[PDB]
Design a protein around this ligand. Structure first.
Ligand SMILES: *CCC(=O)Nc1cc(C(=O)NCc2cn([C@@H]3CCCC[C@H]3OC)nn2)cc(-c2[nH]nc3ccccc23)c1
Length: 279
């Protein structure tokens, strides 16, 4: 089913000419539907593009299309197949978690990372159970937010990943990366909660790999007033031995995860305030 946009619950029989280009962002464009007025995200894939690049653009689209019942993954409205290109209509979000770290110029409050952690873990657990896919590249770049308070995962073309957020067993595998995304989430949490990257002063990709193995996991400092439930979640995610790393089924029952499921925090109001101070 191509040539149909499904924003909300309305199916629109439209073409690529019914979308106005509003400029490059993030080849993903910010485009505007002229028939209705919606502003959406359109990823353009050139047929004459790279085979390795395009093969990733169809892998994430394959699982994004089958992740329609997951509210923690960016949803694809439709697709436009012309004789030259392929246009993937993704929903429009505010920005990513990596860009939020630069706009903040400092740490992100724990209450925001709580709803973020609940959203990301459910996304990975949904991928491991419903479709049996692992992300293999979890980092702040793939954590999107919007002015409505929603937090979702973003395209996983490799479902090796980024060498900085690598898990210890994905570097020295004893012979399996079933729970290696748990470590990647932990490294991303320490980076956003402190503002600094945990493995600092590393000029080569091999240096972080040594510090991941040769040095104790980088935990959260105690003089920043972080919650006890939040510090134990980072310690469990950053367990060095892969065999003692908790599964996703045990993470959903953690005291920190269940704390921010029932608690309703205003991510929408906090997101509009930080993005207001632009450069
Ligand atoms: C980490 C890199 C990244 O996430 N880049 C990225 C940037 C944007 C972006 O800059 N969007 C700008 C934008 C924001 N708005 C809102 C909502 C519509 C009305 C105007 C604003 O509200 C006042 N409009 N444009 C966006 C994305 C992004 N968004 N959805 C994506 C899906 C898949 C990939 C990237 C997406 C990413």
């Amino acid at each position: 089913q191509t040539g149909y946009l499904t924003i909300g619950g309305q199916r629109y029989q439209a073409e690529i000419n019914d979308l106005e280009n509003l400029g490059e962002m993030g080849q993903v464009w910010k485009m505007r539907f002229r028939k209705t007025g919606h502003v959406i995200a359109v990823k353009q894939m050139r047929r004459s593009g790279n085979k390795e690049e395009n093969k990733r653009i169809l892998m994430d689209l394959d699982v994004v299309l089958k992740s329609h019942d997951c509210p923690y993954i960016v949803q694809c409205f439709g697709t436009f197949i012309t004789n030259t290109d392929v246009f993937i209509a993704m929903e429009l979000m505010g920005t990513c978690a990596e860009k939020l770290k630069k706009r903040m110029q400092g740490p992100i409050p724990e209450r925001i990372l709580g709803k973020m952690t609940v959203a990301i873990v459910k996304a990975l657990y949904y991928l491991k159970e419903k479709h049996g896919v692992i992300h293999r590249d979890v980092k702040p770049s793939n954590i999107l937010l919007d002015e409505r308070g929603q937090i979702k995962l973003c395209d996983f073309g490799i479902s090796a990943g980024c060498a900085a957020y690598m898990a210890p067993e994905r570097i020295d595998p004893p012979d399996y990366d079933i729970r290696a995304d748990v470590w990647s989430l932990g490294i991303s949490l320490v980076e956003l909660a402190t503002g600094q990257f945990p493995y600092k002063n590393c000029k080569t990709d091999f240096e972080v790999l040594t510090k991941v193995l040769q040095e104790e996991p980088p935990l959260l400092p105690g003089h920043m007033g972080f919650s006890g439930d939040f510090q134990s979640f980072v310690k469990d995610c950053l367990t060095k031995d892969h065999r003692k790393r908790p599964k996703y089924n045990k993470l959903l029952e953690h005291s920190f995860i269940k704390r921010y499921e029932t608690l309703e925090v205003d991510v929408a109001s906090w997101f509009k305030d930080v993005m207001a101070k632009t450069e």
